[PDB]
Structure formats: C-alpha cells, structure tokens
Amino acid sequence: DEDETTALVCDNGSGLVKAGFAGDDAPRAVFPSIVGRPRHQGVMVGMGQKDSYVGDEAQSKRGILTLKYPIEHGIITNWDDMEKIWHHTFYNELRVAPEEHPTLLTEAPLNPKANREKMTQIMFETFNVPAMYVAIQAVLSLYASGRTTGIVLDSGDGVTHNVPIYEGYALPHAIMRLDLAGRDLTDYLMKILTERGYSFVTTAEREIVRDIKEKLCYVALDFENEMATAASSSSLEKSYELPDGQVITIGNERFRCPETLFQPSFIGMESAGIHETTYNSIMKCDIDIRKDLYANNVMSGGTTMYPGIADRMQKEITALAPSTMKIKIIAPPERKYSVWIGGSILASLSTFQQMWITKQEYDEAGPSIVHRKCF
C-alpha cells in the first residue's frame, strides 16, 4: 500500500549480504555474497536442478563447482552474478517482490560513480522498485555509534577499509585498502590445521573451518604470554564435531589465525596491520581535525567480531600513536550488522525524502540522479 509501506534494507557487504525491513531490529536474511555454477555432474552426482547456485546453497550442493564473488576485491567488477545476488536476496531469501518495496542498498567504501549509477539502473530496470538510494556502509555504523565525525575501520570478508569521516562525508584519497580479509584468515586457519595434520582442502571442509573461525577464534592481547599460557593450559584446546559425527580438535590455532590481521609479518606478508592503516589514514588528515579521530575509532565489518580485538586495537594504537590525545575505540557487540541496523532505523523515517531517488527522477534524468541525493 505504496509509500506508507515498510522499506526494504539490504547491506551488500563483501562476503555476507545482510537484509530485511526498516523496523526489523535484527536482519531477516543473511547469506554469502558468492555465486557459482556446477561442473562435472553425471560422473559423481546427479545433474543440477539449478544450473547456478548462490550463497551457502552454492557451498552445500555437490559437484566440481566453480564459485565467484562478483565483488571480488571489494569493488563490484562483475554485475552478471551481482544481479543474481539481488534476485536471490528478494525472491529466494527475504521472499518478497522488490516491485512492492522502496529499497535501501549499501555500498562498500570507494564505490566508483559508474558503479553507483549501475546500482541505480539495476533497482529500476532489473527489479522495478518505486524508489531507492545507495549509502556508504561506514556512515551508518558511525551514526549508530553516535558520531558524525570520526574514523571507521571496516574489516569485511573480501576487503578491509580504513575510512576517515568529517560530518558524514568520507575523504576518498586518505582511505587505505588492505586486501587481506576474512576469507584469507580462513586460508591461514586451513594451513595451521594442516600443520596439526588435518586434510582440510575441500569447500565442505573449508566452510566448516569458516564456521570454526567465527565460533572459536579470538585475538591474543600479548601473543608470547598467550603462547606460554598455551604450553601450560587446561582450557585452550576445543573439540568440535564434523556434521557426519567425526570429532576434530583445535586450540592455539584459535589465536594464531586472526593475529595476521594485526601482524602480517606472522605470515611473511610485507604489509602494515589494521592499527597502522587506521593510523596512516588519520595521520594524512589536517592537524586541527586529527584529535577526535583518535577518540572515535569505530569497528564495523564481519572480521572485527573476534574477542580481544578492540582491546588489542587499544594496545596496538597506544604502542604506535602518542598518548597526549585521548584514544577511544567504539566496537558494538553485533558490529557485523551495525551498518544494517543503522540502515533499518534510518530507512524507517519518511520525514524527509529529497535524498530518496524516485522512478520519476530516473525517467527524467537517468542514474546520474545518484550524485544530487548526497546533499
């Protein structure tokens, strides 16, 4: 019952699409931002009733299946499978018609003008929505964390981003990229489980290892102390059943895994850590505004969810940046969804609509409308 309806909100994050409605206080769909197509069926499995799979479904259903993230390195390079992710979101996971619902999309930091305009095309051409917008992830997490000026670290699954923000506007040139993300920490978890003598090679083992990572990993505050306490423990080691009922066991690996996000040196990568890339983003900004960027470090993203990470960030920043400014982190307990929560609450308010792109403005003036709405 048109513009008086509840708006649809989809956070289009780098390896987890989080979606629902404006006034759902937690998401209504969560699935991997991955698409695939089977190969080699008839030889070890029956021929696919779906000759293309998306999400968890694409990891589940058997064959020599070739997967892709269409947002492969944090920018949407392929549209062919990203338009399948949006089709899958609405008609398969949320189980609504997008032609019913005004739609808030998010974008990952650095999203090109032509990607923003193609994201405006898709909602009116491929999905026929009444109205929409495309908002940057970091500002919703920042505003829900109670700031309009500050710095967001997002660590997603397919990219990590360090984003200085001044009254809702992020400064693009000073944004620092880190190409090591959640998927790649899972590759190091597979390696250190191979050192413990496990097979872990298949997609079926890897997504159990990806579950084990989010269920059981933590960041050590002092790694040498943690490894000395590991060599004298009675609690570190954790047994875990595989879904066929076979038991495995993981321990020290729970803190060896995410340590590489702060200290890439730990895997021989000649790159700077999340604290240094945050510091390098702040230290490129003008002197008179740096003070309250150190007091307002927001943790967004899926890979910032590990215990001890914000407390380690506090330690690692005070071991790197001077102590005359007051250092503060703000790291919400549901942080992976905090972006979408900020989206849900903002997208419930019909109280000013100049920022919302209508189908009228599209049929007048095309996708280029998306730049006039940022004001």
Binding site: D1, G20, R28, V30, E57, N92, L94, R95, E100, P243
Partner: protein
Amino acid sequence: MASGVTVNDEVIKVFNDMKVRKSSTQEEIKKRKKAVLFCLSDDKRQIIVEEAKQILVGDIGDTVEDPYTSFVKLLPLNDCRYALYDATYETKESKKEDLVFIFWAPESAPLKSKMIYASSKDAIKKKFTGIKHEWQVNGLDDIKDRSTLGEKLGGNVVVSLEGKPL
C-alpha cells in the same frame, strides 16, 4: 508405460501464493496459507491439490498451539503426499523465512504410491522455483516433535521455529 506422473500447474498457483509475503495492511493477515498439501489424482496421471487440513493466520492463536503442528498431527496415515511448508524461524544472529518442499511417505503405504511419488521427485520440483530445503519424510518418527523439524530444516543454526523455542 514406464515413468512417473506429471505436475499439474495449479500447484504452482498455490506455491507462488504461499511462498511470498503480501502487503501487511490486510493481505498478509488475510491471504497467507502456512501449510499446503498435494496428492496423486486417482486418474494415476498427475499430482493435484486435495482435501487437506491447511491453516491460515488466526487459527494458530484461536485454536492450534502452532501451525506446523496442525499439518504434522493430521498427515494421511497410510498414503504418501507431496507438501509445502512456509518455515518461519529464529537463528542465533537473525530472523529467517525458508520454503520447505516435503515428500511425505508413511513407511506402511502402498509400494506403487511410493514409486509414483518417488519417480515424480524430479518433475514437480523444477516448477517450484526458489525451493530452499527438501524433506524426504519417511514415517512419523521422521517428524517427531518441532525441534526435530528444526534439525530437518537447518540443524543447530535454528533456536526458535514457528513460535516454539527449540
């Protein structure tokens, strides 16, 4: 003649009415069907819709202690059926809704009913665009309680299902 029965398109009318939301103003509260069942027509040619005890919306509060309960306490005791269920469930991080496709087979049923419904497992399913989870249900001990339906849906990821907490 040596293959299974065809799907009659009136199951696709039912599926694409069941599976979707509507506007919540009235139409969600007045048009949804939470459980729906299909049968082999005794022409022996096709799967159709049958006199089967569905529930809608108010029927869950006004009488039957959960909707899934209304279906799985009233399954035909000695014949096989195809069914859909609109599962609405709570995980450890989100709400979710998923579309269950159900082959019901009571293990004591006729061997020729079983063969007809088994050889149409391929045929009916290509029409049911966006089916997530398939149940092959083999006896009422493959239903059990409502927590076993959460295990048969999504395992330990689910913590509440249909308003029954697991």
